[PDB]
Design a protein around this ligand. Structure first.
Ligand SMILES: Nc1ncnc2c1ncn2[C@H]1C[C@H](O)[C@@H](COP(=O)(O)OP(=O)(O)[C@H](Cl)P(=O)(O)O)O1
Ligand SMILES: [Cl-]
Ligand SMILES: [Cl-]
Ligand SMILES: [Mg+2]
Ligand code: NA
Ligand code: NA
Ligand code: NA
Length: 326
DNA sequence: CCGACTGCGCATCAGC
DNA sequence: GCTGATGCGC
DNA sequence: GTCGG
């Protein structure tokens, strides 16, 4: 990629501030800076040039000057040498371990992958499954496997009830050649903003996917969100596929377009789009777009009949999923 | 300068 | 138990 | 850490 050095540097700084400093705004600021530079269709030749971009200010511009001149950042060099920082950054790579638990473990002398395996009784359930599939969860998913996975999920959902609709979102819907996980949007005519005519709607789908050994583990589960682990079946003598993260989101069917807009992302595109909505006087979530009145209180849901309607409200030209990879 | 920074489900904990 | 805050991940 | 007002 065109400014890969700079965006990697900024991502490492973002990870440091979230994981180690526990400074969530610095984290979001670095990620915004990285995203706008990754977008920029010119090889950046100075910090001043990059400062022209929205979300690059004085401090990042100076870091960019250091990096272009020397190929590195002293601040990052030091972070990498610091044992406490390095240990906490590593521990947050386990799904379910964040900045707080990572620092808790390191304070206790639990600093390595071995230390976790030796201390499984100190992990909650999510962290336990994350440790178990730590290696698997580092591997990306080729689109060819996502297509197999899509085909399994959609057919099994159909066998539970043919009125379900399951839509694979995330990077897959944006056309990516590889995905980090599988995100499935689900709807059913019984569950709308106005009524829930049948419960267990998500449960029945999860149960059927466990029955056929597609879903292998559960990280968390509720009435509308499932987060867990799945695996493609392998053939005779074939090495097994890696285990994969899967998230299933049950959205009221009349709220499908806000739901699919949300679950298609990217996360930074969503953040940017919701920022713009506020500037235009609306608030967007995965259910509705609503105005902000005189008090900045969210009013009543606006009528939405397409993803593009959402764009129309905030005065953005429609962007196809493949152009939302920010 | 400096207040605001996207929005929310599920798990866990704390205080009653 | 419930409620609200926090942790974590999406 | 950045920025609109
Ligand atoms: N912090 C956030 N704020 C708003 N929307 C978010 C969000 N995080 C995620 N979403 C929305 C927007 C996301 O697109 C959707 C899925 O989240 P996933 O973490 O799986 O992101 P992806 O795009 O699929 C990644 Cl490129 P990969 O999974 O291939 O590694 O959820
Ligand atoms: Cl901060
Ligand atoms: Cl809502
Ligand atoms: Mg995803
Ligand atoms: Na700027
Ligand atoms: Na983690
Ligand atoms: Na996900």
């Amino acid at each position: 990629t065109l400014n890969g050095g700079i965006t990697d540097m900024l991502t490492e700084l973002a990870n440091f501030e979230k994981n180690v400093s526990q400074a969530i705004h610095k984290y979001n600021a670095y990620r915004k800076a990285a995203s706008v530079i990754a977008k920029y269709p010119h090889k950046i030749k100075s910090g001043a040039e990059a400062k022209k971009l929205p979300g690059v200010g004085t401090k990042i511009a100076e870091k960019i000057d250091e990096f272009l001149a020397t190929g590195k950042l002293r601040k990052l060099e030091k972070i990498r040498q610091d044992d406490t920082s390095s240990s906490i950054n590593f521990l947050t790579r386990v799904s379910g371990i964040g900045p707080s638990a990572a620092r808790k473990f390191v304070d206790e002398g639990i600093k390595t992958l071995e230390d976790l395996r030796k201390n499984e009784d100190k992990l909650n359930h999510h962290q336990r499954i994350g440790l178990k599939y730590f290696g698997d969860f580092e591997k990306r998913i080729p689109r060819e496997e996502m297509l197999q996975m899509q085909d399994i999920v959609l057919n099994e959902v159909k066998k539970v009830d043919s009125e379900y609709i399951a839509t694979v979102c995330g990077s897959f819907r944006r056309g990516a050649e590889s995905s980090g996980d599988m995100d499935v949007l689900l709807t059913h005519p019984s569950f709308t903003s106005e009524s829930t005519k049948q419960p267990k709607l998500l449960h029945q789908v999860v149960e059927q996917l466990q029955k056929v050994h597609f879903i292998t583990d559960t990280l968390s589960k509720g009435e509308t969100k499932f987060m867990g682990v799945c695996q493609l079946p392998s053939k005779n003598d074939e090495k097994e596929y890696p285990h994969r993260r899967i998230d299933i989101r049950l959205i009221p069917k009349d709220q499908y377009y806000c739901g699919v807009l949300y679950f298609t992302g990217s996360d930074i595109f969503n953040k940017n789009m919701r920022a713009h909505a506020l500037e235009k006087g609306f608030t967007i979530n995965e259910y509705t777009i609503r105005p902000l009145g005189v008090t900045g209180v969210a009013g009543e849901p606006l009528p939405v009949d397409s993803e593009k309607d959402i764009f129309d409200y905030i005065q953005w030209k429609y962007r196809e999923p493949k152009d939302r990879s920010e």
